[PDB]
Amino acid sequence: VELTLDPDTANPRLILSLDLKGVRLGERAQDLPNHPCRFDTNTRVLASCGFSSGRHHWEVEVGSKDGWAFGVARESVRRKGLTPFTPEEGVWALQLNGGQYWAVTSPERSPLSCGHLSRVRVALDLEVGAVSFYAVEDMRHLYTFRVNFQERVFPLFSVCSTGTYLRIWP
Amino acid sequence: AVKLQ
């Protein structure tokens, strides 16, 4: 029922928690098989469940320090080589970097004056075409990407430095 | 390290 991180997609430097809800960046690459679905360079992991229709919620507990980005990716997001982290590559995400919260628009990111984030509710609407993010304390709106999604969409998580984490909460 | 996000 509830989402878990999919180890076969995870960049081999990531460490997934035993319960498959949490992700952080490790200090060494694990020796994992080089499956076509595995992100081999960018520090990403998908949930094991993707969505082709309907409306869906999940929540993400976020670290207080820099290094994370999360949201959704189109299934065709490129897995191999160093790729941009942009809407054009099929990534729609929030990010904590430089001590600021961002919606990762392109070519320039959009800084969010949202105050401190602890947990975020993600609302994916494949019927109308939107993904929205809310801070759970008061459900204040963080950002909405309006996208005419044309394929299956997966929850996406990325952690590119040590000292922070993301965790699915349900 | 954001290049690898």
Swiss-Prot record, chain A:
Gene encoding the protein: TRIM7
Primary location: nucleus
Protein name: E3 ubiquitin-protein ligase TRIM7
PTM characteristics: Auto-ubiquitinates via 'Lys-63'-linked polyubiquitination.
Keywords: Antiviral defense, Coiled coil, Cytoplasm, Golgi apparatus, Metal-binding, Nucleus, Phosphoprotein, Transferase, Ubl conjugation, Ubl conjugation pathway, Zinc, Zinc-finger
Subcellular location: Nucleus; Cytoplasm; Golgi apparatus
GO cellular component: cytoplasm; Golgi apparatus; nucleus
Keyword Transferase attributed: yes
Domain B30.2/SPRY: 1-170
GO terms for biological process, alphabetical: antiviral innate immune response; innate immune response; protein ubiquitination
Tissue expr: Skeletal muscle and placenta, at lower levels in heart, brain and pancreas. Isoform 1 is widely expressed with high level in testis, kidney and heart.
Parent-record interval covered: 342 to 511 of 511
Subunit structure: Forms homodimers. Interacts with GNIP2. Interacts with GYG1. Interacts with RNF187 (via C-terminus).
Effect listed in the UniProt record for changing residue 160 to A: Complete loss of interaction with GYG1
GO molecular function per UniProt: ubiquitin protein ligase activity; zinc ion binding
Function recorded in the entry: E3 ubiquitin-protein ligase that have both tumor-promoting and tumor-suppressing activities and functions in several biological processes including innate immunity, regulation of ferroptosis as well as cell proliferation and migration. Acts as an antiviral effector against multiple viruses by targeting specific viral proteins for ubiquitination and degradation including norovirus NTPase protein or SARS-CoV-2 NSP5 and NSP8 proteins. (Microbial infection) Promotes Zika virus replication by mediating envelope protein E ubiquitination.
Family listed: Belongs to the TRIM/RBCC family.
Free-text note on domains in this protein's UniProt record: The B30.2 domain mediates interaction with GYG1. The coiled-coil region mediates homodimerization and heterodimerization.
